[PDB]
Design a binder for these strands. Structure first.
Ligand SMILES: [Zn+2]
Lengths: 78, 204, 99, 60, 128, 154
RNA sequence: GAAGAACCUUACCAGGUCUUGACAUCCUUUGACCACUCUAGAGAUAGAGCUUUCCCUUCGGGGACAAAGUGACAGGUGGUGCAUGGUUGUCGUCAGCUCGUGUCGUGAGAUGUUGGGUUAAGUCCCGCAACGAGCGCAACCCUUAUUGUUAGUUGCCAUCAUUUAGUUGGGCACUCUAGCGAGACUGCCGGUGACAAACCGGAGGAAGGUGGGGAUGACGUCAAAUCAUCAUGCCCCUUAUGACCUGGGCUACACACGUGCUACAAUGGGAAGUACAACGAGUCGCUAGACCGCGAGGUCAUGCAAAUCUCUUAAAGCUUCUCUCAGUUCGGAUUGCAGGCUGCAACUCGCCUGCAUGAAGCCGGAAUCGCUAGUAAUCGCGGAUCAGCACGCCGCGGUGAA
């Protein structure tokens, strides 16, 4: 319930932008907690940070609604 | 441990507080300012050694007053130290403080001063039994109805703690028409830390 | 008429002694003062557990008590206003005047 | 590990949900009466001495 | 004309009985007998002082009750009426003291204790 | 309890029948302080009494008391580490309390759909040697006197 | 401990980092700083920008202040409760624990404090080489249970009019508010008892046998708990076990135990209409009314620093229909979808609404817990901490047992 639209920080935007007409980069080091996904963020490759490790994951177009917090499982049950 | 601070039992009935305020919406500011007020007589207590400070309050004025048994060092040579203490207190306050000095009579029948004195003999390596006994006799020489005394800790610069004290006269503790006093004070020569407690009774 | 005051303190003895003093000075230059109307005397409680580390099964509480009195004045003189501004003490009660 | 933290809590906060409550003369994080800015037990100690106006014992 | 007074109290509920020579009814808070007093059978409950004094009527009753629960404020009606019947004639006070209905029930809700679940119920405490 | 005997709390009669027994009957139905519901369903039980074979609304309750009320019960009065329970005559108030218990506190088990057919017709049945609470007293007297010889000397 | 863990809270981790330091005191150079915009970033920080600032001038100077030097030093939620003070559990509201004087005993010591009766009690009577006293017990304190006086608004409406309406004219009559007062002490009578303490009944009264509760915790026991509220003997760390920031975690789960909430339905569920409490809280806090919404709610706004305005018209209650014994119109967990609110931000990890879903569960062995009357059992309401979050805690009131 975030009735006034999505929420993505502006200190997430500042790594690269010129990968819009070219083949994208591989390094996206971040914190990857607060920001959700809205369709301008499709098909990148982000090192999602889980408190210890910026774990790399790339994007499908239907991995689209939830935040960057599904893909930082901080439990380590193995 | 089970017992009660006895002045916290009789307050409201046969005595009052030491802050006669009635303040809304500026209460905790004056509380933690009065907390600073009480600390500042550490300059006094090494020499002046007052017992109680009653703090009443007008609209925009500060009207305090003290009780003591030693009127010498508190009045200065000609009141010049008195105005200096007013200035140094106002530097922490910023408000019109108007201090006062009231002298107590029969001064040996206090609570805090006698315990402070026997803690002073403890801080000069003087034996605890003789000091307690001469203290309760010289308090009985003042004219009373009873004195209870108790000291604890590592007594007389020794090992694992004992706790022992002596009493004479009557002391109705469990009764409310009492008008008794009470005081606790720490002690240390160099070993650990000790504590003295002291009681009087003089009827209602 | 154009004056009614309030009394709020902690001790009813200080309340009604200062109230009897101001009733004594009330119809000095004026007339027709109304008496000490009582008020329901709000009260609070607290709760402090009797330990430092454990032992919530034994507790302790205190109370705030605020006694309130009320004195109304009907058809006053102008001379009592400057008289009551010469009346300032005791300090344990705080007055609450209107016009 | 608190003499830096008491000075940390006297500062204006980074944002709104950081200025919590602790005691003044001690530094307890839990069980502080915000009407008094005291903890549970320093209030208990000062309550007996007649040094807090208002408060009495309560029996009814 | 003249009216007959009386008051009755029970269970943190107070009543002001106003007895008049009438026909035998009760009006409470400017309503009827059993509009504001609900389905409970408490008629001969209230008319039990009438069964020992002036059976059964015929006096209409004015009362303005407030506070408490319904049965407690109903039971307080009994005692203003019996106080009124003592006000009318002295010759029934023996008949009231044989029947009671004059002593105020001083028994009300008990003070708790800080440390239990209820005023006397203690919590479960497993021995092993 | 330990020191001496305790008081016993005589009660108030009804607002209609002026009965203490029917009042006590209501009070051993009452759950969670809901007195008016239990009282009103007991007056409904008297209305079911009055219609179907209406004889007397209270004599049927007294005959329900007739066919239930005990006279004997065993009590474990050992002396020196034994098991010699003695069939002992019961106190009269405990006798009536056991009767009320066997009437109402057994009537949970009729299991019929109408909610007071387990009450009204049940106490109708106890008036004329029917209802299983009579045979409760029968088997109670039969397990009584099982030590008629070696316990009645104490 | 925790009377409120999303960041802060924190002491636990991964990383980015720093050093008379995040905090205290003096010395000089100097004197007053700051604060705020732009760029980098995850932040601490870095580089610029407006400049900072004198409150005595006897040209002589420190008080409000920064930065630099090292010097003093700082810091530890690190250890030891078996080195401690202070504080608190527990026997337990159990009824005991002692002293002076005179006697007995060669002496350590004893008697008083033992015996008969009675009591909640070392509470009291009688006999007793004992006579008296103190700390306890009891009494004085608070609240509840009647009534007199005093004072009548923001309180109430009886003598009348009015208005939706005690509203407005009026009164302090009742109620209520709360100051000062009276009242329950074996007080009188009858029996029992050695005639004594005392026990059992009766009249009077509001309550008669310490009327009902609370606060009040002796000598001492357990090296009981506490350096993690505080202070602290001793020992250890110090370009670091000290400090700043981001993100995570204390909220995991193959399992076993303790404590609470909700049900296993007919004294019941579902729908409709219909009454009566008490305590307390309120300024960046409670919201009157109005409009709209299935709703969580949204908007405009009126009263309120208080017997006045709001929380707030309480639930079980009462009357009609309903279902007809089923895993059920009982039950209400689990799961998709759609939302609402505070938060910079509800993934890890807040609460609440709506739609769709509908599991166990038909009174629970061995065993074990609480309670002697406004109690037990059931039902709601308020407060603390709190942006937000309560089946926990603290308190009040309704119905009312064996
Ligand atoms: Zn504190």
């Amino acid at each position: 319930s975030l009735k006034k639209g999505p929420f993505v920080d502006d200190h997430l935007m500042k790594k690269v932008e010129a990968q819009q007409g070219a083949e994208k980069k591989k390094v996206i080091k971040t914190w990857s907690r607060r920001s959700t996904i809205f369709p301008s963020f499709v098909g990148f490759t982000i090192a999602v940070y889980d408190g210890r490790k910026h774990v790399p994951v790339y994007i499908q177009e239907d991995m689209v609604g939830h935040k960057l917090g599904e893909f930082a499982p901080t439990r380590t049950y193995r | 441990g089970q017992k009660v601070h006895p002045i916290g039992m009789r307050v409201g009935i046969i005595r009052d507080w030491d802050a006669k305020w009635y303040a809304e919406k500026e209460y905790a500011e004056f509380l933690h300012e009065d907390l600073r007020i009480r600390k500042f007589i550490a300059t006094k207590l090494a020499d002046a050694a007052v017992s109680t400070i009653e703090i009443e309050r007008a609209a925009n004025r500060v009207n305090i007053s003290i009780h003591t048994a030693k009127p010498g060092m508190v009045i200065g040579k000609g009141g010049s130290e008195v105005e200096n203490l007013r200035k140094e207190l106002n530097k922490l306050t910023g408000k019109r403080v108007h201090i006062n000095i009231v002298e107590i009579k029969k001064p040996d029948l206090d609570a805090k001063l006698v315990g402070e004195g026997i803690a002073r003999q403890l801080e000069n390596r003087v034996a605890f039994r003789r000091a307690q006994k001469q203290a309760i006799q010289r308090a009985m020489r003042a004219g009373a109805k009873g004195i209870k005394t108790q000291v604890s800790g590592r007594l007389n610069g020794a090992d694992i703690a004992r706790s022992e004290g002596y009493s004479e006269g009557t002391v109705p503790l469990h009764t409310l028409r009492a008008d008794i006093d009470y005081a606790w004070e720490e002690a240390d020569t160099t070993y650990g830390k000790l504590g003295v407690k002291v009681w009087i009774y003089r009827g209602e | 008429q154009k004056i009614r005051i309030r009394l709020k303190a902690y001790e009813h003895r200080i309340l009604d002694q200062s109230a009897d003093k101001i009733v004594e000075t009330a119809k000095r230059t004026g007339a027709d003062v109304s008496g000490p109307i009582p008020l329901p005397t709000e009260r609070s409680l607290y709760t402090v557990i009797r330990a430092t580390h454990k032992y919530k099964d034994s507790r302790e509480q205190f109370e705030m008590r605020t006694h309130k009195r009320l004195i109304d004045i009907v058809n006053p003189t102008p001379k009592t206003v400057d008289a009551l501004m010469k009346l300032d003490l005791p300090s344990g009660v705080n007055i609450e005047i209107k016009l | 590990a608190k003499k830096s933290m008491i000075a940390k809590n006297k500062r204006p906060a980074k944002h709104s949900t950081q200025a919590y409550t602790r005691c003044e003369r001690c530094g307890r994080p839990h069980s502080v009466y915000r009407k008094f800015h005291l903890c549970r037990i320093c209030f208990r100690e000062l309550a007996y001495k007649g040094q807090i106006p208002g408060v009495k014992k309560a029996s009814w | 004309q003249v009216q007959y007074s009386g008051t009755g109290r029970r269970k943190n509920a107070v009543a002001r009985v106003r007895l008049v020579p009438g026909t035998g009814k009760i009006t409470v808070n400017k309503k009827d007998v059993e509009e504001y007093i609900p389905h409970a059978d408490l008629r001969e409950v209230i008319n039990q002082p009438f069964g020992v004094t002036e059976t059964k009527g015929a006096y209409d009753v004015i009362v303005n009750v407030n506070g408490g629960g319904y049965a407690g404020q109903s039971g307080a009606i009994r005692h203003g009426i019996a106080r009124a019947l003592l006000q009318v004639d002295p010759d029934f006070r023996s008949a009231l003291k044989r029947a009671g209905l004059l002593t105020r029930d001083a028994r009300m809700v008990e003070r708790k204790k800080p440390g239990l679940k209820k005023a006397r119920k203690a919590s479960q405490f497993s021995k092993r | 309890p330990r020191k001496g005997p305790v008081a016993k709390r005589d009660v108030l009669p009804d607002p209609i029948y002026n009965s203490k027994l029917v009042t006590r009957l209501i009070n051993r139905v009452m759950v969670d302080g809901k007195r008016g519901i239990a009282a009103n369903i007991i007056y409904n039980s008297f209305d079911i009494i009055k219609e179907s074979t209406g004889n007397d609304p209270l004599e049927v309750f007294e005959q329900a008391m007739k066919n239930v009320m005990p006279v004997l019960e065993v009590k474990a009065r050992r002396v020196g580490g034994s098991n010699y329970q003695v069939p002992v005559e019961v106190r009269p108030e405990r006798r009536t309390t056991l009767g009320l218990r066997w009437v109402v506190n057994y009537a949970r088990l009729r299991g019929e759909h109408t909610m007071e057919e387990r009450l009204a017709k049940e106490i109708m049945d106890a008036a004329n040697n029917t209802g299983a609470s009579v045979k409760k007293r029968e088997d109670t007297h039969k397990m009584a006197d099982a030590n008629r010889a070696f316990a009645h000397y104490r």
